[PDB]
Scaffold this active site. Structure first.
Site, PDB file in Angstrom:
ATOM      1  CG  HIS A  75      -0.355   0.886   2.474  1.00 50.40           C
ATOM      2  ND1 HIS A  75       0.577   0.067   2.888  1.00 50.40           N
ATOM      3  CD2 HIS A  75      -0.722   1.199   3.312  1.00 50.40           C
ATOM      4  CE1 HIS A  75       0.876   0.177   4.192  1.00 50.40           C
ATOM      5  NE2 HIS A  75       0.039   0.637   4.690  1.00 50.40           N
ATOM      6  CG  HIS A  77       0.452   4.857   4.561  1.00 50.79           C
ATOM      7  ND1 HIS A  77      -0.911   3.490   5.807  1.00 50.79           N
ATOM      8  CD2 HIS A  77      -1.120   5.284   4.702  1.00 50.79           C
ATOM      9  CE1 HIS A  77      -2.368   4.518   5.465  1.00 50.79           C
ATOM     10  NE2 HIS A  77      -1.792   5.179   5.550  1.00 50.79           N
ATOM     11  CG  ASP A  79       3.897   1.360   6.806  1.00 53.40           C
ATOM     12  OD1 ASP A  79       3.491   2.074   5.747  1.00 53.40           O
ATOM     13  OD2 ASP A  79       3.615   0.847   8.153  1.00 53.40           O
ATOM     14  CG  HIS A 137      -4.243   0.073   6.692  1.00 52.19           C
ATOM     15  ND1 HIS A 137      -3.823   0.371   7.619  1.00 52.19           N
ATOM     16  CD2 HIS A 137      -3.201   0.270   6.349  1.00 52.19           C
ATOM     17  CE1 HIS A 137      -2.603   1.802   8.122  1.00 52.19           C
ATOM     18  NE2 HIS A 137      -2.761   1.339   6.524  1.00 52.19           N
ATOM     19  CB  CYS A 156      -0.710  -1.898   7.192  1.00 55.30           C
ATOM     20  SG  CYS A 156       0.563  -1.517   7.163  1.00 55.30           S
ATOM     21  CE  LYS A 159      -2.525  -2.329  11.282  1.00 53.28           C
ATOM     22  NZ  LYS A 159      -3.142  -1.244  10.441  1.00 53.28           N
ATOM     23  CG  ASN A 165      -3.432   6.445  11.276  1.00 51.60           C
ATOM     24  OD1 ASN A 165      -3.626   7.699  10.624  1.00 51.60           O
ATOM     25  ND2 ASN A 165      -2.518   7.660  11.967  1.00 51.60           N
ATOM     26  CG  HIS A 195       3.000  -2.080  12.390  1.00 45.35           C
ATOM     27  ND1 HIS A 195       3.924  -1.480  12.290  1.00 45.35           N
ATOM     28  CD2 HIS A 195       1.424  -1.723  11.083  1.00 45.35           C
ATOM     29  CE1 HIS A 195       4.081  -0.763  10.528  1.00 45.35           C
ATOM     30  NE2 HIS A 195       2.284  -1.081  10.314  1.00 45.35           N
TER      31      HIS A 195
HETATM   32 ZN    ZN Z   1      -0.846   2.156   6.301  1.00 44.46          ZN
HETATM   33 ZN    ZN Z   2       1.690   0.213   8.591  1.00 42.63          ZN
END
Ligand code: ZN
Ligand code: ZN
Length: 221
Positions: A75, A77, A79, A137, A156, A159, A165, A195
């Site tokens: 994705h 983001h 990270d 996400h 991400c 979860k 977030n 994570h």
């Molecule tokens: Zn993310």
């Molecule tokens: Zn993330």
């Protein structure tokens, strides 16, 4: 001063790379990705945050005789994508979905050099598959499936204990997306979140439970 990049064997032909960022309110949070080996070729499943750690990761594998053939980012983001620019500068093919590349551009970031679209995409036929479960996400989140070892990199999207977030989340769609993912990958042996710790297919059910609760919370005042 952040902890060093980790590289650890997860299974035959599969490594987990862990890089670290400071998150205000949460301390230093790990981000896990994979490196997948196909014969003498390595594929990065997500980049570390930084160009520097992306280089360390590439160099660790190249020193051992592997040829970096591509990265795919799960994705938009940072990270998942923070090393794309550096890889592009070394003529290493970078991949993301069309939507991920849109959201990179919208966010003011360097795009992957190769894109794809559709629910299912083979990065490497019979070895590395990319699946789009729907928005969660983020609108673009995808997962990566390794059929031979039944390993799912959930990024991400996965979860199990809390959604993290919500700034770019589609909370209305996440439960549907999570139901679809759970229905599709029930025989996963290992499920790798971004994570939190590696687990098994139960992380799909726990993610669904979290998405359902998140959507309910969103409808409160
Ligand atoms: Zn993310
Ligand atoms: Zn993330």
């Amino acid at each position: 001063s952040l902890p060093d990049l980790k590289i650890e064997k997860l299974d035959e032909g599969v490594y987990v790379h862990t890089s670290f960022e400071e998150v205000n309110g949460w301390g230093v949070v790990p981000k896990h990705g994979l490196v997948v080996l196909v014969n003498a070729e390595a594929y990065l499943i997500d980049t570390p945050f930084t160009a520097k750690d992306t280089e360390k990761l590439v160099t660790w594998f190249v020193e051992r005789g592997y040829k970096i053939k591509g990265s795919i980012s799960s994705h938009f983001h940072s990270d998942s994508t923070g090393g794309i620019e550096w890889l592009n500068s070394r003529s290493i093919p970078t991949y993301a979905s069309e939507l991920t590349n849109e959201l990179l551009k919208k966010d003011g970031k360097v795009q992957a050099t190769n894109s794809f679209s559709g629910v299912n995409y083979w990065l490497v036929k019979n070895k590395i598959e990319v699946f789009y479960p729907g928005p969660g996400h983020t609108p673009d989140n995808v997962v990566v499936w390794l059929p031979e070892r039944k390993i799912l990199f959930g990024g991400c999207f996965i979860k199990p204990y809390g959604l993290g977030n919500l700034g770019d989340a589609n909370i209305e769609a996440w439960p549907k997306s999570a139901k679809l993912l759970k229905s599709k990958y029930g025989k996963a042996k290992l499920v790798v979140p971004s994570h939190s710790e590696v687990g098994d297919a139960s992380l799909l059910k726990l993610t669904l439970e979290q998405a359902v609760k998140g959507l309910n919370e969103s409808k409160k005042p």
